[PDB]
Write a protein that binds this ligand. Structure first.
Ligand SMILES: Nc1ncnc2c1ncn2[C@@H]1O[C@H](CSCC[C@H](N)C(=O)O)[C@@H](O)[C@H]1O
Ligand SMILES: Nc1ncnc2c1ncn2[C@@H]1O[C@H](CSCC[C@H](N)C(=O)O)[C@@H](O)[C@H]1O
Lengths: 228, 55, 226, 59
C-alpha cells in the first residue's frame, strides 16, 4: 500500500525535498500561475512545491494531496499559512469538482499511480479549460539508471518513455505544450578516483544520470469541450 | 483545513457534494459526509482523509 | 516597397551574427517544443532560418515555412538551407498568409516585439494554429530586462515593451491558453572574470550576469484553443 | 517553394484562395510564377522559389 511504502519516507521527507528541489525549482518557475490561482499538488511529500509557488508566484489556494497520512501531517507542520491545505487522497479518484483547479503539479509521484491513464483523465477533469498539468519524473525509460528502482519498491511502477508520456497525455485529452529534460547541476559528482560509490560504478554514469538525463518534465493543457 | 477551501472538494467515490460537520475550529476536527453515498470522511488535526473507503 | 534596418542587416552579415548569439537560448526553447515528426511549423521573422534547420535536424518536421518581411533576409535563409522541405516566403506579421487551423506550431525568436499590432498578430497566430498547437514566443526585449530598454534608441521600429504579466494577458486576450512562461539563461556567452570589466559592452560583471543569467530570454508558450 | 506546401497558403488580405500560375518548375519545386488572389485579384510573385506574400501596399 501507499502508506506502507511511504511512511518510512515521512520519518527523510525533507531529504527528498532537498534532492528534488535541484530540478523542481526550474520546473516550478515555468508554471504560468496568476496571483490567486488554485493549485493541486499530487503526492505532495513535504509540501515544498506549494510553499514555493505561494512564495514566488502568489498562488491563492493550494491543496497538497498524499496517500500517506504521516506525510501530510509533516507537510502541514512545515507550512506557515492556512491558504495551503493538506489532505489524504489517492491518485485514482481525485476529490475535487470538475473544472475547479487552475493548475496541477506532481513531482516524483505520478509513476506510482495504479492506473496512470485514469489519473491523467482525472487531472483533465479537475482542471479548468486552459489549466496546466506539470508532470515531473525521475523514473522513465530513457533514464537507464532508474530502471533498477523497481527492485526496492513494493508498488508496481509505470515506466514510460518521453514519447509514451506525450501519447498518454493526448489520450487523456490534454494538449502537450512542452516536454523537456531538466539537469540536476547541484548534486556533487566526485573525481573519477572516488568510484565506485554506493550508487554508481563509474563517474560517466553519474554525469549521464544528472547532467544529461535529469528530470523529465511534460506539460499538458486541459481543453474546452470539442468535437469528437 | 480552512473551511473556505472545502468549496471544491467532493466525494472521491462519485464526485458528489459533501456536508461539513465541525467539532473543533480553520477546521481542526470534524467530518465531511457524502450527500449521496453517506460515506464519512474524517478531518483530524486539520487534515481531511478523502481516500475512497476501501483504502 | 520601403527599406529598413532588417534589409541592411541581411546585406552586411548581421543575420548570421544574430543566429550565433540567439542560438544560445533558442536551442533550449526549441528543444522543449512538443514538435512531432512530420509536423508543419511556421517561423515568424526567420532571419537566417536557423530555427527551422534546427527543428528539421532535431525533431524531423515535415514542412517548415520561414516568414520574414525582408526579401534579402529570406533570400539569405533560402541560400543557407539545403533542403526543399523548408520553404521561405516574404510576409508581414499583421496578416499571415496561411489558412485557418493549418499549422501545428509557430516559433518566433527576437521578432514578435516589432509587430505593428501585437494583439492582431497574436490573433493571427491563434487563427492559423490547429487546436492544441503551440506558439513559442521568445524575446530578449521586455520590461523586466532593464538592460534591453536602450535597444529602442538603436532601431527606428516602434517596439512593444511588455512585462511577463503583459505577455500572459495578451496571449489570453487573443484566445491562446498560456502553458508556460520561463526565463532562459544564456549559459554559452563568455562572462569574463570581474577584474576584466569594464568591457566594450558592460560596465560590471554583475550587470552582464543579470542580463544573461537572471533575466535571459523570456519564453511565453501559448496553446491554440478549439 | 514546393507546390505541395502551397496547399495552406492564402491571400494575406482576406484569407481567400490563391490561384497558382507556373512559369518555371523543377518537379514539385515552383521557381518562377505567381499566386493570384481569387477575390482581390492581387498578384503575389514567386521569384527564384520565394513567394512575396506581403500585402500590395508594402511592395
Ligand atoms: N497512489 C497514490 N496516491 C496518493 N499519493 C501517492 C500515491 N503514490 C504515491 N503517493 C505519494 O507520492 C509521494 C512520492 S515521493 C515525492 C514527494 C514530493 N513530491 C517530492 O518531490 O519530494 C509520496 O509522498 C507518496 O506517499
Ligand atoms: N512586421 C514584420 N513582418 C515580418 N517580419 C518582420 C516584421 N518585423 C520584423 N521582422 C523580421 O523579424 C526579424 C527580427 S531579428 C530575429 C531573427 C531570427 N528570428 C533570430 O532569432 O536571429 C528580422 O529578420 C525582421 O526582418
Amino acid at each position: 500500500s501507499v502508506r506502507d511504502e511511504f511512511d518510512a519516507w515521512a520519518a527523510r521527507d525533507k531529504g527528498m525535498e532537498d534532492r528534488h528541489w535541484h530540478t523542481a525549482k526550474h520546473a516550478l518557475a515555468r508554471m504560468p500561475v496568476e496571483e490567486g490561482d488554485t493549485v493541486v499538488d499530487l503526492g505532495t511529500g513535504s509540501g515544498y512545491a506549494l510553499r514555493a509557488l505561494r512564495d514566488t508566484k502568489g498562488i491563492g489556494r493550494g491543496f497538497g494531496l498524499d496517500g500517506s497520512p504521516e506525510m501530510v501531517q509533516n507537510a502541514r507542520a512545515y507550512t506557515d499559512t492556512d491558504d495551503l491545505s493538506f489532505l489524504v487522497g489517492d491518485f485514482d479518484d481525485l476529490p475535487f469538482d470538475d473544472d475547479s483547479v487552475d493548475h496541477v503539479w506532481s513531482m516524483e509521484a505520478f509513476y506510482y499511480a495504479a492506473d496512470p491513464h485514469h489519473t491523467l483523465e482525472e487531472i483533465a477533469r479537475i482542471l479548468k479549460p486552459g489549466g496546466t498539468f506539470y508532470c515531473a519524473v525521475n523514473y522513465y525509460e530513457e533514464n537507464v539508471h532508474s530502471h533498477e528502482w523497481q527492485e526496492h519498491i513494493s508498488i508496481d511502477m509505470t515506466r514510460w518513455s518521453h514519447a509514451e508520456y506525450r501519447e498518454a497525455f493526448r489520450d487523456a485529452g490534454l494538449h502537450v505544450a512542452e516536454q523537456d529534460s531538466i539537469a540536476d547541476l547541484d548534486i556533487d559528482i566526485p573525481a573519477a578516483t572516488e568510484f565506485p560509490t554506493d550508487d554508481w560504478e563509474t563517474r560517466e554514469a553519474m554525469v549521464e544520470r544528472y547532467r544529461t538525463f535529469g528530470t523529465l518534465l511534460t506539460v499538458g493543457v486541459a481543453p474546452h469541450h470539442h468535437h469528437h | 483545513m480552512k473551511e473556505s477551501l472545502m468549496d471544491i472538494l467532493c466525494d472521491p467515490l462519485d464526485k458528489s457534494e459533501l456536508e461539513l460537520e465541525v467539532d473543533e475550529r480553520e477546521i481542526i476536527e470534524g467530518r465531511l459526509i457524502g450527500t449521496v453515498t453517506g460515506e464519512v470522511y474524517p478531518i483530524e488535526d486539520g487534515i481531511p482523509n478523502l481516500l475512497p473507503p476501501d483504502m
